[PDB]
Design a protein around this nucleic acid. Structure first.
Ligand SMILES: [Mg+2]
Ligand SMILES: [Mg+2]
Ligand SMILES: [Mg+2]
Ligand SMILES: [Mg+2]
Ligand SMILES: [Mg+2]
Ligand SMILES: [Mg+2]
Ligand SMILES: [Mg+2]
Ligand SMILES: [Mg+2]
Ligand SMILES: [Mg+2]
Ligand SMILES: [Mg+2]
Ligand SMILES: [Mg+2]
Ligand SMILES: [Mg+2]
Ligand SMILES: [Mg+2]
Ligand SMILES: [Mg+2]
Ligand SMILES: [Mg+2]
Ligand SMILES: [Mg+2]
Ligand SMILES: [Mg+2]
Ligand SMILES: [Mg+2]
Ligand SMILES: [Mg+2]
Ligand SMILES: [Mg+2]
Ligand SMILES: [Mg+2]
Ligand SMILES: [Mg+2]
Ligand SMILES: [Mg+2]
Ligand SMILES: [Mg+2]
Ligand SMILES: [Mg+2]
Ligand SMILES: [Mg+2]
Ligand SMILES: [Mg+2]
Ligand SMILES: [Mg+2]
Ligand SMILES: [Mg+2]
Ligand SMILES: [Mg+2]
Ligand SMILES: [Mg+2]
Ligand SMILES: [Mg+2]
Ligand SMILES: [Mg+2]
Ligand SMILES: [Mg+2]
Ligand SMILES: [Mg+2]
Ligand SMILES: [Mg+2]
Ligand SMILES: [Mg+2]
Ligand SMILES: [Mg+2]
Ligand SMILES: [Mg+2]
Ligand SMILES: [Mg+2]
Ligand SMILES: [Mg+2]
Ligand SMILES: [Mg+2]
Ligand SMILES: [Mg+2]
Ligand SMILES: [Mg+2]
Ligand SMILES: [Mg+2]
Ligand SMILES: [Mg+2]
Ligand SMILES: [Mg+2]
Ligand SMILES: [Mg+2]
Ligand SMILES: [Mg+2]
Ligand SMILES: [Mg+2]
Ligand SMILES: [Mg+2]
Ligand SMILES: [Mg+2]
Ligand SMILES: [Mg+2]
Ligand SMILES: [Mg+2]
Ligand SMILES: [Mg+2]
Ligand SMILES: [Mg+2]
Ligand SMILES: [Mg+2]
Ligand SMILES: [Mg+2]
Ligand SMILES: [Mg+2]
Ligand SMILES: [Mg+2]
Ligand SMILES: [Mg+2]
Ligand SMILES: [Mg+2]
Ligand SMILES: [Mg+2]
Ligand SMILES: [Mg+2]
Ligand SMILES: [Mg+2]
Ligand SMILES: [Mg+2]
Ligand SMILES: [Mg+2]
Ligand SMILES: [Mg+2]
Ligand SMILES: [Mg+2]
Ligand SMILES: [Mg+2]
Ligand SMILES: [Mg+2]
Ligand SMILES: [Mg+2]
Ligand SMILES: [Mg+2]
Ligand SMILES: [Mg+2]
Ligand SMILES: [Mg+2]
Ligand SMILES: [Mg+2]
Ligand SMILES: [Mg+2]
Ligand SMILES: [Mg+2]
Ligand SMILES: [Mg+2]
Ligand SMILES: [Mg+2]
Ligand SMILES: [Mg+2]
Ligand SMILES: [Mg+2]
Ligand SMILES: [Mg+2]
Ligand SMILES: [Mg+2]
Ligand SMILES: [Mg+2]
Ligand SMILES: [Mg+2]
Ligand SMILES: [Mg+2]
Ligand SMILES: [Mg+2]
Ligand SMILES: [Mg+2]
Ligand SMILES: [Mg+2]
Ligand SMILES: [Mg+2]
Ligand SMILES: [Mg+2]
Ligand SMILES: [Mg+2]
Ligand SMILES: [Mg+2]
Ligand SMILES: [Mg+2]
Ligand SMILES: [Mg+2]
Ligand SMILES: [Mg+2]
Ligand SMILES: [Mg+2]
Ligand SMILES: [Mg+2]
Ligand SMILES: [Mg+2]
Ligand SMILES: [Mg+2]
Ligand SMILES: [Mg+2]
Ligand SMILES: [Mg+2]
Ligand SMILES: [Mg+2]
Ligand SMILES: [Mg+2]
Ligand SMILES: [Mg+2]
Ligand SMILES: [Mg+2]
Ligand SMILES: [Mg+2]
Ligand SMILES: [Mg+2]
Ligand SMILES: [Mg+2]
Ligand SMILES: [Mg+2]
Ligand SMILES: [Mg+2]
Ligand SMILES: [Mg+2]
Ligand SMILES: [Mg+2]
Ligand SMILES: [Mg+2]
Ligand SMILES: [Mg+2]
Ligand SMILES: [Mg+2]
Ligand SMILES: [Mg+2]
Ligand SMILES: [Mg+2]
Ligand SMILES: [Mg+2]
Ligand SMILES: [Mg+2]
Ligand SMILES: [Mg+2]
Ligand SMILES: [Mg+2]
Ligand SMILES: [Mg+2]
Ligand SMILES: [Mg+2]
Ligand SMILES: [Mg+2]
Ligand SMILES: [Mg+2]
Ligand SMILES: [Mg+2]
Ligand SMILES: [Mg+2]
Ligand SMILES: [Mg+2]
Ligand SMILES: [Mg+2]
Ligand SMILES: [Mg+2]
Ligand SMILES: [Mg+2]
Ligand SMILES: [Mg+2]
Ligand SMILES: [Mg+2]
Ligand SMILES: [Mg+2]
Ligand SMILES: [Mg+2]
Ligand SMILES: [Mg+2]
Ligand SMILES: [Mg+2]
Ligand SMILES: [Mg+2]
Ligand SMILES: [Mg+2]
Ligand SMILES: [Mg+2]
Ligand SMILES: [Mg+2]
Ligand SMILES: [Mg+2]
Ligand SMILES: [Mg+2]
Ligand SMILES: [Mg+2]
Ligand SMILES: [Mg+2]
Ligand SMILES: [Mg+2]
Ligand SMILES: [Mg+2]
Ligand SMILES: [Mg+2]
Ligand SMILES: [Mg+2]
Ligand SMILES: [Mg+2]
Ligand SMILES: [Mg+2]
Ligand SMILES: [Zn+2]
Length: 63
RNA sequence: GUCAACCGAGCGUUGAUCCGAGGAUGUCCGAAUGGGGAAACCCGGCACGAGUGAUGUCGUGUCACCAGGCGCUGAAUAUAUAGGCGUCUGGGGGGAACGCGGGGAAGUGAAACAUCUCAGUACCCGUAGGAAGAGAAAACAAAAUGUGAUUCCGUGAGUAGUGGCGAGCGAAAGCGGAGGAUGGCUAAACCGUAUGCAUGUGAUACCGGGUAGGGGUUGUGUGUGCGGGGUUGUGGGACCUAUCUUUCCGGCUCUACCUGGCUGGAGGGCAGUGAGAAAAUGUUGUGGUUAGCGGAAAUGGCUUGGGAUGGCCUGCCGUAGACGGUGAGAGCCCGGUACGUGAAAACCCGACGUCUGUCUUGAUGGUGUUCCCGAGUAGCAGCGGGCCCGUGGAAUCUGCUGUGAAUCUGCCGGGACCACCCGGUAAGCCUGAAUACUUCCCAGUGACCGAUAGCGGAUUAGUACCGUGAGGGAAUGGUGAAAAGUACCCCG
RNA sequence: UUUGAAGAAUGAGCCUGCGAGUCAGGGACAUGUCGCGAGGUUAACCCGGGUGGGGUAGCCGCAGCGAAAGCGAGUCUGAAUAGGGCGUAUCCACACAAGAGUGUGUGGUGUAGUGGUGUGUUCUGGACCCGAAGCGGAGUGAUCUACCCAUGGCCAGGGUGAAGCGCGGGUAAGACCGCGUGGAGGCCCGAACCCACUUAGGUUGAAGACUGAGGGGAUGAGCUGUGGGUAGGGGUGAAAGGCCAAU
RNA sequence: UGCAUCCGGUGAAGCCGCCGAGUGAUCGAGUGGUGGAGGGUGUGGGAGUGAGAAUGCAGGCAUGAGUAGCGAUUAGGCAAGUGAGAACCUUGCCCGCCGAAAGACCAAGGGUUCCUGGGCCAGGCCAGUCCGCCCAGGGUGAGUCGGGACCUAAGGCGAGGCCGACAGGCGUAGUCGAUGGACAACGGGUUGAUAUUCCCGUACCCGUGUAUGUGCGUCCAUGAUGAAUCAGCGGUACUAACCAUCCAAAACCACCGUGACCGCACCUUUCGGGGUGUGGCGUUGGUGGGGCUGCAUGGGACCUUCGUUGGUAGUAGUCAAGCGAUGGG
RNA sequence: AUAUAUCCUGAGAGGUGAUGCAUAGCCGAGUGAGGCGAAUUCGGUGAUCCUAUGCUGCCGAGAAAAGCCUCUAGCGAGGACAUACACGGCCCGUACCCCAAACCAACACAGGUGGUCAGGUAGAGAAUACUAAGGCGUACGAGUGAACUAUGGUUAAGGAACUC
RNA sequence: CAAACCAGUGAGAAGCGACUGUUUACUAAAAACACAGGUCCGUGCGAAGUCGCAAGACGAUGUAUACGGACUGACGCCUGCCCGGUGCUGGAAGGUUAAGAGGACCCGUUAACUCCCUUUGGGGGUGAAGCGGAGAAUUUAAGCCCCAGUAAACGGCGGUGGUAACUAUAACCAUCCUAAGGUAGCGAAAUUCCUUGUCGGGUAAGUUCCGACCUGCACGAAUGGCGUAACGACUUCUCAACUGUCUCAACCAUAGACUCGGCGAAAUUGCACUACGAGUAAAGAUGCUCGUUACGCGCGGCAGGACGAAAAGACCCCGGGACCUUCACUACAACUUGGUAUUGGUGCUCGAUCGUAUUGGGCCUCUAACCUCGGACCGUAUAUCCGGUUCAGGGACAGUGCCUGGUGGGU
RNA sequence: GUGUAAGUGCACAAGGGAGCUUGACUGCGAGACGGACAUGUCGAGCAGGGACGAAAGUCGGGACUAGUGAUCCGGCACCUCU
């Protein structure tokens, strides 16, 4: 819940809301997961904290 | 140097001290950086010298972490990588405010109270700078054939608006001003090179007239890397086809001989320490700063007077009658005042001949047909945030999650939203001046205080003292003009 | 302060100093007063080591009515002369009506606001002065106490006598019992130590919690030195709303 | 503050009196005494502008008052000395009190309170020659005691690492961290103060080195062994069989029950269905007899698998001494 | 091999240490130092001190690491073992107080503060009573038969009738 | 003749608690706390539950004969009946409902037009495709509603009337209603208001005590009932000794109080040449009226007044705080669902334009995303952290985000 | 006796019946009453249309006095408002 490696997406802070509409401070943390992505076409794969936005950005590739 | 005096030793006409510029010296703790640690203290490794009969012993240096590179090494293992070393360059902490940015509340008002307000305030945190930040419209405007980056002022106006439509909050457009730089580029529609991965009909296919010699720019798809030149506002650029064309040379579009498309070298540019090319090449103002020099004119006389600058009388000078001191009110007494002058050396602000780059293989004006200019971006569904705007009919901005575009008969804006037309190029980038602040220094000023005031602090003050801590936190000025601070005698 | 105080209602030991309606805003209004007058005035800003000059950007009134279109000395209402609401500053003289008080038409008197300066009030600012219980953010504390963690130390003396053990009884083996040994025990009495039950004194005390007589445990859930960790809406808590540095 | 400018060392402001005047807040070019350096008419201007109170604040001084108290449970008297003064100090005599302390050593802590010398304002709840007062001087002596050179617990810090909006939080290798473990000291004497430190006498254990006497190799060579090499075997028992033991796949013989068929006699509704007894099969429920061949279960042997040597190659490469760990016990 | 075999551990006792020292006292010498200097044996009691980190017995089952000894991985042509030898071992604390007028309590305060030493007579004793060593009478005193208060002693007879 | 110091009062009846023990430092040491005994429930091991926005650590280097939570509290006899309410536990067939998808209606705009007017589309309505606005129905999980269980889970266990051989009764039947309507035991008790209930014991006298009766206002069986040996600085009561606690105080030795010398305080304080009584009055007067009495001043004592001093009254009320409780409001932490993403494939089975079509649901597989706290290597000379490699197990689950619904005095 | 309590009124009816029918109108409103204020009450006359009565005239709710709710936010219809 810290940071996504490439997108640079630090979690943002905002306030929730009731139906009565009374505020309270809360947070949002980007959807971060690690995968053993492919780096070089030689087969070397490594792990990097990536979010869904980055994944669908598809800098990381699959076989 | 001072308290503080005092002595005692002493230093000077050759110029000692005093002030300024550069330099060296700088124990230890303290980012502390050789390891450790209860700060000012313990314990080592490595390289060079020295002394002892040698050791003992001594000095000197170097020895942190992280970041970024370079060279060497390489584990699982085969390549290679992590890791491992060693070396250069940076940063590390502190500082009053200001600025940016990440986060961010309640007391309070609403006469209660949740929305709301208090307010993005205090406070915490990470950054740089002397300013920062913002900054060249994807802005406004509204038919005028208008504005023309940002920033800061005074308006516009407590108006339009927002709000349990309450308390409250609060624009924009336009106008007048300060300051100005309409300011130049990178990277995708061709090519030369360092290139590789792939393959050969390995010859009739590759060079821009004619003769001749010579022997995979992949066939097909996709992605990545390297570039001249294409970056709209009347709507705009190129795989090919109609016109003038202000130097030369070579090599290319897989070869050699007209037409077409590029790159390299000899010459007018574009400018350059720059936000749009990078690194280097060096210096003149009586400019200032750091300290300094000169700088006028009454012993004038008398009176009170302890003491005169005072009262009276003369004469005084002034480009200087700000100021302070000297025995009471001083321009004619001293420090000094206007004015003039001045730096061996160093430093901040202003030009000028070594030396450097580029380009004139590039540039300017003229007639028609056919893969580029910011993508996970604009916009979208949900969720929230900032714009006066609290979902309200809600644009514009940002963003968390899922989604997701066109590229010129493209986009987005014009305050739900649509059509004709109206106006300006988003997703890349930087860039002075106007502005804010003052821990620090200088010079001046005050209808500012004059010791319970004024900074807590005119004095050994952030001390004594209190608290183990964070922290709190005092009271305490004047003898005299000068110490001439009471010799000596007497009581005790 | 009170309806009301000589008050036995509050405050004042005394003296001296210090101590309380201030201050800002083209803020708003009214009253004084000052200049000009259908006009009044400028902000910011530029240039005079000096308050000058420039600067009309802007604001208020000269016209109001209507929510608005819009109209305009009228306008709104309304289907409307058909009067009413609001203004036409305000009045004088002439005529027309009813004399529903006044309205409707003519000729003159012709409209007074604005910017200082000082003042009361309101305005937002802490807004006449001192004063709270408390909420929130950042930090400082476990040198007492609570708990716990590691390492050490402490518990004079004197009794009680489990299991177990051996022998003798007893079994067929037992089991069971007498005898001597053994000495367990949150066992007993009682010093150090640690506590706090009663009384007394003290309660401007020797002491911000004690002194003296007695008072319980006193080999353990014990106590004690040592050094460490647990931080505030949290700790800890053999639980009382206790302790967390006399709070 | 502005001003015509003045008042004053022939005495300003301030302080304390006196006089006179205004209805008031006051005033007086109104003065007497202290004071010895600045005030200021008038007319405006601006204010931190007027104190008795707020259990106000700070300072000073009141009263209760010369009152309460002088801080234990042990307690003194006296002689003589110093001194101005002597219950309180010094010396002496007796008395009393503690004596698991009210004595003697340390740690923690404090830091000069230790000793000597001088004086007694201030401090000691009184005086005070005395003091833990002040003033000056002196005083702290370690290879062997203690803290670092050593090692570690609880726990803290922490490269890299992991996680975290920032800050930071964790925890590995490591490094810190005593209240523990590790190495050596005794008695006497000494000054006014130090002592297991100084002196005396006698010992010790750790760290470096000496070089010889023991005396030991590597650079000679003797000892114990030790193990990485060519030729086959485990009656067990690969492959046609024999003796003995229980079982049955291609149903012969015999009976019986009858999926279903052909029917022979009787019963039954008038005849029907149907039941009973039986005959021929068929079985709702396919072996025995015999040989060729091929495979499956044990026997001896044929060629390749041994009873580790026959030369060699104790010819040559190896050292243990002496110290050798970030490792093991 | 069951051997008091062997090894390890081990307070204590004897000897040397020590013909030394100290010593009660003797002499001259006074604020007090100096020289000389006798005996220096026995038994018996006896610890909470030491053997002991031991022995027995119990469950609640009672640190780590180092130093030391020892074994080897990586070397090697000079180390091992003693001793005459004169050499060589840091820095810092070391005074004083330390159940107190010196520390923590604002004081020269009837409080608290951890470890060590533990005499004699009675006694079980580390209680208690009196004493040595040694240190104190802890800083207001002098005088007065009052109340009254506090600390105490004694009390005719009655014995809880006071009083919750 | 234990002569000193030192050195247990004892016994009886009972209440509560098993006891040793701990606690409200600095007013409460108990009957409270705590425990040893049991009970219920949760907890399958990267556990349950904790601290922590995370890694991670405790739990534990433990493993259901362990750990956590809650209740009662040795031991013995026991621990009755009630599942409507609230909870918890199982069952989701039905009804209601999330987000998310979605596209019928309705609405806006505009090319063409549509009457007539000119000549080179608007003024008297339709509505083009897209654009958009509100906008559908349709798919939806948990939960709630619903069905059962559960009381050592929180909790309840009645009233009404009638009904005997003299006498008061109910020991039997009928009423309502809820789920049932208090069983054993004990009971004017630590609960009993009348109440000092009545009776008996103890005393002359007993509102306390003990022992019984039961009219239990308003006991009661794990927020446990009844007894209980021992224990207790616990509660009540009685008895013998005991005594100055008392009848009823007396004397005496001590340190103060007193006088003398020395040093030298504090609270309070508008004034002060400060009497009495009756009256008056802001309603109890040293200070007013009236009358009485009284030379000025001290010292020791005693406390009735000076509404005496100390603390801006606790109680009460009035404008406000903090903490706490809960089915008060509004939320939020945590727990829980689905969709969506980290996201892959085959086979089957189910639908709206029995032989032609509808793309998603449910299942079984598999590796390859992902997890692994399994193993074994390496970084390493030492490393249980960590990173990489291999294999092994899982595996498209899980976890994680975002939206959403539940629950939510934990905050 | 007079719709719903009491008072005030009411026979000239405000009491019944019938006929007819909508004035329980539209826009104003001279002036008043009460109101601290927001509000609340009464009312002759003027313009269109209608109702009853031939006409005269009466008709702007019930014999009167109770039967009620501010502001915001929102919903719905019409207009020669933007
Ligand atoms: Mg991150
Ligand atoms: Mg924010
Ligand atoms: Mg908020
Ligand atoms: Mg996708
Ligand atoms: Mg210099
Ligand atoms: Mg130097
Ligand atoms: Mg360091
Ligand atoms: Mg460093
Ligand atoms: Mg590098
Ligand atoms: Mg490789
Ligand atoms: Mg409010
Ligand atoms: Mg309020
Ligand atoms: Mg607020
Ligand atoms: Mg705001
Ligand atoms: Mg700079
Ligand atoms: Mg800029
Ligand atoms: Mg404006
Ligand atoms: Mg307001
Ligand atoms: Mg180009
Ligand atoms: Mg180009
Ligand atoms: Mg155009
Ligand atoms: Mg000069
Ligand atoms: Mg003179
Ligand atoms: Mg001058
Ligand atoms: Mg002068
Ligand atoms: Mg001068
Ligand atoms: Mg809004
Ligand atoms: Mg909008
Ligand atoms: Mg463009
Ligand atoms: Mg500027
Ligand atoms: Mg402090
Ligand atoms: Mg009054
Ligand atoms: Mg009065
Ligand atoms: Mg009085
Ligand atoms: Mg009063
Ligand atoms: Mg009072
Ligand atoms: Mg009052
Ligand atoms: Mg008072
Ligand atoms: Mg104003
Ligand atoms: Mg005028
Ligand atoms: Mg001007
Ligand atoms: Mg209007
Ligand atoms: Mg109208
Ligand atoms: Mg003014
Ligand atoms: Mg706070
Ligand atoms: Mg701490
Ligand atoms: Mg037994
Ligand atoms: Mg025994
Ligand atoms: Mg006893
Ligand atoms: Mg006393
Ligand atoms: Mg205190
Ligand atoms: Mg007694
Ligand atoms: Mg115990
Ligand atoms: Mg802390
Ligand atoms: Mg709290
Ligand atoms: Mg309690
Ligand atoms: Mg309580
Ligand atoms: Mg406390
Ligand atoms: Mg004079
Ligand atoms: Mg004079
Ligand atoms: Mg004078
Ligand atoms: Mg003056
Ligand atoms: Mg003036
Ligand atoms: Mg004042
Ligand atoms: Mg005063
Ligand atoms: Mg007053
Ligand atoms: Mg006062
Ligand atoms: Mg007094
Ligand atoms: Mg007295
Ligand atoms: Mg006295
Ligand atoms: Mg005392
Ligand atoms: Mg004397
Ligand atoms: Mg004694
Ligand atoms: Mg003792
Ligand atoms: Mg003793
Ligand atoms: Mg200490
Ligand atoms: Mg002296
Ligand atoms: Mg003196
Ligand atoms: Mg004194
Ligand atoms: Mg001194
Ligand atoms: Mg690190
Ligand atoms: Mg760490
Ligand atoms: Mg660690
Ligand atoms: Mg260490
Ligand atoms: Mg240590
Ligand atoms: Mg010493
Ligand atoms: Mg010593
Ligand atoms: Mg040595
Ligand atoms: Mg030292
Ligand atoms: Mg010493
Ligand atoms: Mg000492
Ligand atoms: Mg002592
Ligand atoms: Mg003190
Ligand atoms: Mg004392
Ligand atoms: Mg004390
Ligand atoms: Mg103690
Ligand atoms: Mg003892
Ligand atoms: Mg004695
Ligand atoms: Mg003694
Ligand atoms: Mg007394
Ligand atoms: Mg007697
Ligand atoms: Mg008696
Ligand atoms: Mg009982
Ligand atoms: Mg008890
Ligand atoms: Mg007990
Ligand atoms: Mg207890
Ligand atoms: Mg207690
Ligand atoms: Mg206490
Ligand atoms: Mg208490
Ligand atoms: Mg108590
Ligand atoms: Mg208990
Ligand atoms: Mg039980
Ligand atoms: Mg239980
Ligand atoms: Mg249970
Ligand atoms: Mg778990
Ligand atoms: Mg209980
Ligand atoms: Mg049931
Ligand atoms: Mg129920
Ligand atoms: Mg549809
Ligand atoms: Mg439910
Ligand atoms: Mg009873
Ligand atoms: Mg009972
Ligand atoms: Mg009772
Ligand atoms: Mg009773
Ligand atoms: Mg009774
Ligand atoms: Mg009684
Ligand atoms: Mg009862
Ligand atoms: Mg009850
Ligand atoms: Mg039960
Ligand atoms: Mg129960
Ligand atoms: Mg209960
Ligand atoms: Mg019970
Ligand atoms: Mg019992
Ligand atoms: Mg008696
Ligand atoms: Mg008496
Ligand atoms: Mg007395
Ligand atoms: Mg006395
Ligand atoms: Mg005195
Ligand atoms: Mg009176
Ligand atoms: Mg009276
Ligand atoms: Mg009186
Ligand atoms: Mg009082
Ligand atoms: Mg109060
Ligand atoms: Mg209140
Ligand atoms: Mg609170
Ligand atoms: Mg989903
Ligand atoms: Mg999926
Ligand atoms: Mg609450
Ligand atoms: Mg009628
Ligand atoms: Mg009118
Ligand atoms: Mg009506
Ligand atoms: Mg009517
Ligand atoms: Mg509203
Ligand atoms: Zn990302």
């Amino acid at each position: 819940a810290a940071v996504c490696d490439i997108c640079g997406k630090g979690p943002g802070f905002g306030k929730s809301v009731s139906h009565s509409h009374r505020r309270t401070s809360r947070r949002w943390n980007p959807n971060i997961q690690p995968v053993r992505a492919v780096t070089r076409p030689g087969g070397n794969k490594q792990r990097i904290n990536a979010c869904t936005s980055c994944i669908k950005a598809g800098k990381v590739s699959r076989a």
